[PDB]
Tab-separated table of C-alpha atoms in Angstrom:
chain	number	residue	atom	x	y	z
A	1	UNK	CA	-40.014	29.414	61.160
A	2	UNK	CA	-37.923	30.045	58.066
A	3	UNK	CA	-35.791	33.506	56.503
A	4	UNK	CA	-36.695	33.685	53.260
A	5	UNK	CA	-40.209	31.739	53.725
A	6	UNK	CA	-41.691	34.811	55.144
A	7	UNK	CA	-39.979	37.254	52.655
A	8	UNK	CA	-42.023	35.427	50.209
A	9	UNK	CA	-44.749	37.033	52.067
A	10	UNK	CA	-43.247	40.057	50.584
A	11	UNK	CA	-43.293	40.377	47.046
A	12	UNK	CA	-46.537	38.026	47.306
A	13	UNK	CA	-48.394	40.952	48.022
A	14	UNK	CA	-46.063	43.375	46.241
A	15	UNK	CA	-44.660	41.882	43.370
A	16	UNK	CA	-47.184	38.775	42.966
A	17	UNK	CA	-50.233	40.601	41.158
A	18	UNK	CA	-49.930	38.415	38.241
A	19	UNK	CA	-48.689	34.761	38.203
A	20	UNK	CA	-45.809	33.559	36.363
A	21	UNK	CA	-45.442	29.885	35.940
A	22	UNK	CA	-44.998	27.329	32.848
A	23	UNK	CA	-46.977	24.477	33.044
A	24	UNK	CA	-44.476	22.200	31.033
């Protein structure tokens, strides 16, 4: 039952339509 847990549902959806992440 977390704050900003859930407003990662946000920009998920919004934001996220890509992925940005380095492997190394």
């Amino acid at each position: 039952k977390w704050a900003v847990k859930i407003i990662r549902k946000f920009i998920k959806g919004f934001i996220s339509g890509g992925k940005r992440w380095k492997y190394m």
